[PDB]
């Protein structure tokens, strides 16, 4: 049926690391900044170190499995794991943080060119996950990280599921789920596909085009299903021409097969990125150590 996953899982010694400071803490757990210094290789690699009990070790290992199986410039790659008391996920340090916080903080300095390139890059990442038969199930602006303002990558595979065999849906059970980003069929029937990731892509783009507004702000999660059933959608962001908003609305069709595919999202946003100010109208757009090696260059 499917192909052998010959990915390599790299077990990193704790002595090869230097935790430097806490970057973030919350529901996921704790993320740290640090430096990885492999073996006697004269190299220092900036890394993010993530900790989430046997349940915690199981779930972080499921995440390590997925991240070790992806290799794409717009997906965060696993560097390895450290087998301490609690299992640590070691990944590439993304120095500018999550894109949600980035657009909120740099609102008045984000031009149409960046907004549309980010849409292209996120869609490339998602189309790659689709190539690997991976449904993310948690695409959102908080889960896109900023390597540089010109280069973003999808992260957080804690909900990601590998469609096997010839299966097309992933039928989930209970568990906390981000209601305001999920397709209507996911809310109602807990069915997840690449096309339900497309819906979340549309909410993510809306997050970017509003400079980090909260979807359905004020509405609790339990009415989302009924609001969506009435035909109500997120509103048109002020900077968005009808060309861009129409793309988002198509991501929110009831019929999942009517939504655009990620490879078509790449094409459309890529055409719009060639003439950004024809598609987004933003005020003032036109005026907007020695041995360190980035993980993307340590192969
Ligand atoms: C490959 C990779 C890299 C990284 C994380 C993950 N994966 C990952 C995977 N699953 N999950 C849940 C993950 O964590 C995401 C949640 C926290 C994150 C924003 C922290 N964070 C960070 N994360 C990673 O590098 N880099 C950061 C650089 C700077 C700052 C300072 N703030 C910036 C914005 N404002 C608020 C000022 C303060 C915070 C940073
Ligand atoms: Cl939510």
From Swiss-Prot:
Effect on the protein upon substituting residue 69 to I: Found in a lung cancer sample; constitutively activated kinase with higher levels of basal autophosphorylation; more sensitive to gefitinib than wild-type
Where is the protein found, in the record's own terms? Cell membrane; Endoplasmic reticulum membrane; Golgi apparatus membrane; Nucleus membrane
The residues annotated as site (Important for interaction with PIK3C2B) are: 298
* Annotated effect of mutating residue 14 to G: Found in a lung cancer sample; constitutively activated kinase with higher levels of basal autophosphorylation; more sensitive to gefitinib than wild-type
Which residues does the record list as N6-(2-hydroxyisobutyryl)lysine (modified residue)? 50
Q: What is the effect of changing residue 91 to M?
A: Found in a lung cancer sample; increased kinase activity
Binding residues for ATP: 23-31, 50, 91-92, 156
Question: Which residues does the entry assign to the active site, renumbered to this chain?
Answer: 138
Tissue localization of expression is: Ubiquitously expressed. Isoform 2 is also expressed in ovarian cancers.
Covalent cross-link (Glycyl lysine isopeptide (Lys-Gly) (interchain with G-Cter in ubiquitin)), residues: 21, 42, 55, 58, 168, 230, 261, 271
Protein name per the record: Epidermal growth factor receptor
Q: Which organism is it from?
A: Homo sapiens
């Amino acid at each position: 049926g499917e192909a052998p996953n010959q990915a390599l899982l790299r077990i990193l010694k704790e002595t090869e690391f230097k935790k430097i400071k806490v970057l973030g803490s919350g529901a996921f757990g704790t993320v740290y900044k640090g430096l990885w210094i492999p073996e006697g290789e004269k190299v220092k690699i900036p890394v993010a170190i993530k900790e989430l009990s046997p349940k915690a070790n199981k779930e972080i290992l499921d995440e390590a499995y997925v991240m070790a199986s992806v290799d794409n410039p717009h997906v965060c790659r696993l560097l390895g794991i450290c087998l301490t008391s609690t299992v640590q996920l070691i990944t590439q340090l993304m120095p500018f943080g999550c894109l949600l916080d980035y657009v909120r903080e740099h609102k008045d300095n984000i031009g149409s060119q960046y907004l549309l390139n980010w849409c292209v890059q996120i869609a490339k990442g998602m189309n790659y996950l689709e190539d690997r038969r991976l449904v993310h199930r948690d695409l959102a602006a908080r889960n896109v990280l900023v390597k540089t303002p010109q280069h973003v990558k999808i992260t957080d595979f804690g909900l990601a599921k590998l469609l096997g065999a010839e299966e097309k849906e992933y039928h989930a059970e209970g568990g906390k789920v981000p209601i305001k980003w999920m397709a209507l069929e996911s809310i109602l029937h807990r069915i997840y596909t690449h096309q339900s990731d497309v819906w979340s892509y549309g909410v993510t783009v809306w997050e970017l085009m509003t400079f980090g507004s909260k979807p359905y702000d004020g509405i609790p999660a339990s009415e989302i299903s009924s609001i969506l059933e009435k035909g109500e959608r997120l509103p048109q962001p002020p900077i968005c021409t009808i060309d861009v908003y129409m793309i988002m609305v198509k991501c929110w069709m009831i019929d999942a097969d009517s939504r655009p595919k990620f490879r078509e999202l790449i094409i459309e946003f890529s055409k719009m990125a060639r003439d950004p100010q024809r598609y987004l109208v933003i005020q003032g757009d036109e005026r907007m150590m020695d041995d360190v090696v980035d993980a993307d260059e340590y192969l």
